[PDB]
């Protein structure tokens, strides 16, 4: 272990959402035994946000998940020297964001350095009309493809009168060390963004996972 029961994170952001740039920068902590995290996030550029804030927040480290005993922790064992991931995210109506995040450490703090962009959300979608309240919670399943981790999660977001707008993401996690292939499991997630001001210029977002099966 390299890791202590609590540990700071702090990241910045740079994106796009159809050709709109922005930045944000976070600073929050986490006990990673536990499986939680918060932190609190800052809109440095291209603010107030013209999307809905919910398509960022699952972008906002898998180190953050209580697993038991019975499974290969392949993101503890990544460390000191770290991992990256890449994820696209597939919505619906076609809007497509791709993500990526190279997760570094010094000390007891968790650097990220995040890169996000997203195209074609239509202008009278849920996402451009923010007319979404957040993400339902759901299960990863991580499993192994030629030698590399991956994580698919089929969600979806909660809309303001009802309704649901589905996302599919796939993920590829890529440690920077030989570190065990784990076998096929779940990460159950739950986010929540807990407080915000009006215009999502300061949030403070949560999430607490467990690993399974």
Sequence with gaps: SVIKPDMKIKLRM???????????????????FEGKQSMDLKV??????????????????????????????????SFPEGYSWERSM??????????????????????????????????NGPVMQKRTVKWEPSTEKLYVRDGVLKGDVNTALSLEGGGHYRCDFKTTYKAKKVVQLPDYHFVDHHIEIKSHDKDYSNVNLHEHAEAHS
């Excluded at 740079?14 to 709109?20: D, L, S, T, Y």
């Design 14 to 32: 740079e994106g796009a959402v159809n050709g709109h740039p922005f930045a944000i920068e976070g600073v929050g902590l986490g006990k990673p």
């Design 44 to 77: 440095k550029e291209g603010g107030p946000l013209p999307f809905a804030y919910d398509i960022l927040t699952t972008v906002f480290n898998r180190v953050f998940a209580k697993y038991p005993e019975n499974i290969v922790d392949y993101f503890k064992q």
């Design 90 to 123: 597939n919505y619906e109506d076609g809007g497509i964001c791709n993500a990526t995040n190279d997760i570094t450490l010094d000390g007891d703090c968790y650097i990220y350095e995040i890169r996000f962009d997203g195209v074609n959300f239509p202008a």
